[PDB]
Amino acid sequence: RNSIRYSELAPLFDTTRVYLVDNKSTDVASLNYQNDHSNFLTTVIQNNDYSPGEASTQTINLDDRSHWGGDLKTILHTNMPNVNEFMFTNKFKARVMVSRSLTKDKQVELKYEWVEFTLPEGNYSETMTIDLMNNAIVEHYLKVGRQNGVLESDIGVKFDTRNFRLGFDPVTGLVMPGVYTNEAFHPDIILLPGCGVDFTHSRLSNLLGIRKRQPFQEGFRITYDDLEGGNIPALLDVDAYQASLKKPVIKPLTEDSKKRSYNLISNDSTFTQYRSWYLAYNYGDPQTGIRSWTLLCTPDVTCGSEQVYWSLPDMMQDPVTFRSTSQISNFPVVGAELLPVHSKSFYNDQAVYSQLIRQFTSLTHVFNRFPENQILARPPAPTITTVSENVPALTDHGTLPLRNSIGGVQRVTITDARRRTCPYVYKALGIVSPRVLSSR
């Protein structure tokens, strides 16, 4: 009526457990080899005698007269890096200045080009991720920039995280303090005329916390031109003003120590040519600015909760509309589950008291190369850093229909959103508990 028979052993009734597990010493040796914990074979047999493979011949038979089903809970555990190549978090296109030249007697010829910089897999934490990006902009300048004109003064594109506008005085037209108040509010990207960044093929966008208000329109390009209204205002010549006590004030600090120009639009304007995203969003025209088509969001280092799909092709019936095949990247799905990664949050009031000390701690100002320029400076570390953290996930799918004849060797397969094994799985295993559902 509801048996469960196996080769030659006492028949069992009503229910039991078949175990899908990678570890088994025997099968690892033989079976999987060129496989990994995301696409492997395993014997469900569990009987000490019998050579695996020869096991493959045997079968667990759930009484034929009834349609069976089984509860499937699984234990999935990864250890995927915040920033890696497979997830698309190690690359990102941006347009920078390539050459600054003296041409055809009087012309200033500026040549800009798009280029894709890559990051060294792993390096978690958001802030640091920013830094690694800024550094990659530089590392490039080091291989092309300088040796083709282009000064530091005109480095296009830099990810910062502050509100260049806190000091700002509605009359002066300047950041009175003479310094862009060094506190971190949200990541944003700053651009110089003519350049900009593109994330079309990268989840890092999600790391900065900047998304399109219309996601499905593939094409994340944020040009200098887009950051309308909201160019970082200029600094008051704190020195002049004070010593001068008319009043100098109108004097908007044009350079800095080591004399770098703050590219001011004209000898008059209080604004600089440096455009900030964060500004355009909440300080620019809400109806036509950038706030119109992009959204200011919480960072999230994981870069985006993605899901993984399970499949047990040789043991569960194929769900409603999937068709059975043998193409690993199209197997039927039997369970979906978010990919095991969380955002742990910490507190480091030590940030920026630490950037200050961190710089001495790290024997180099590698990230802060321009410790004077109020722009190109090293963005403030924000209190509350986030870090992707891997965690085992004791998930639980529902009862799923089973085949009344379970093969000795079952194939287990965890796929990702785009349907492809996921290299970062360290442990995957599931427990199935069959039971009756109705009869034929």
Partner 1 sequence: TFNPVYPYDT
User: Looking at beta carbons only, is 221 or 247 nearer to partner 1?
Assistant: 247
Q: Tokens representing 222?
A: 């944020």
Considering the complex, what minimum distance in angstroms separates the CB of residue 354 from partner 1? 18
Burial 54-64 (b: 16+ CB within 10 A, else e): ebbebbbbbbe
Question: Residues 336, 223: contact at Cβ < 8 Å?
Answer: no
Establish if 99 lies at the interface with a second copy (CB under 8 A).
no
**Would you call 223 exposed, middle or buried from its count of C-beta atoms within 10 A (0-12, 13-18, 19+)?**
middle
CA atoms within 13 A on the CB side of 158: 28
Q: What is the CA radius of gyration of the chain?
A: 30
Shortest CA distance to 27 belongs to which of 386, 410, 432, 434? 410
Q: Taking CB within 5 to 8 Å according to partner kind, which of partner 1, a second copy, none is near residue 292?
A: none
Tell me if 392 contacts a second copy by CB under 8 A: yes
Closest CA to 341 of 318, 385, 308, 366: 308
Alpha-helical runs (H) found in 180-266: 204-208, 238-243
CA–CA dist 380, 181 (Å, integer): 10
Q: 126 CB contacts (<8 Å, ≥6 apart)? A: 187, 207, 299, 301, 382, 385, 386, 387
> 339 contacts which partner out of a second copy, partner 1, none, CB within 5 to 8 A by kind?
none
Q: Which CB sits closer to a second copy, 152 or 194? A: 152
- Select from 120-128, 168-176, 222-230, 323-331 the region that touches partner 1 (CB under 8 A): 168-176
Q: Taking phi first (over 0 means left), then psi (-120 to 50 degrees means alpha), and beta for anything else, what does residue 166 get?
A: alpha
- 370 lies in the binding site for partner 1 (CB under 8 A): yes
To the nearest whole angstrom, how small is the minimum distance from the Cβ of residue 27 to partner 1?
A: 48
What is the smallest separation between the CB atom of 151 and a second copy, expressed in angstroms? 17
User: In whole angstroms, how close is the CB of 208 to partner 1 at the nearest point?
Assistant: 25
Q: Which of residues 5-64 bind a second copy (CB under 8 A)?
A: 5-19, 21, 23, 25, 28, 32-37, 40, 44-50, 60
Q: What minimum distance in Å lies between the beta carbon of 105 and a second copy?
A: 31
Among 129, 163, 202, 415, binds a second copy (CB under 8 A): 163
Size of the site for a second copy (CB under 8 A): 163
- 164 binds partner 1, rule: CB under 8 A: no
Is 258 a residue that touches partner 1 (CB under 8 A)?
Answer: yes
User: Pairing mode, if any, of strands 174-175 and 231-235?
Assistant: parallel
19's tokens: 């175990």
Residues 227-246 that bind partner 1 (CB under 8 A): 238, 242
Q: Which of 202, 106, 195 shows the shortest CA–CA distance to 158?
A: 195
Stretch that binds partner 1, among 6-14, 140-148, 283-291, 428-436 (CB under 8 A): 140-148
Q: How many C-beta atoms lie closer than 10 Å to residue 10's C-beta? A: 7
Among 77, 369, 427, 435, binds partner 1 (CB under 8 A): 369
Rule CB under 8 A: choose which of 115, 128, 176, 431 binds partner 1.
176
Q: Is residue 169 part of the contact set for partner 1 (CB under 8 A)?
A: yes
65, 111, 247, 344: residue in contact with partner 1 (rule CB under 8 A): 247
Interface ranges with partner 1 (CB under 8 A) = 138, 141-142, 146, 152, 167, 169, 172, 176-177, 238, 242, 247, 249, 258, 365, 369-372
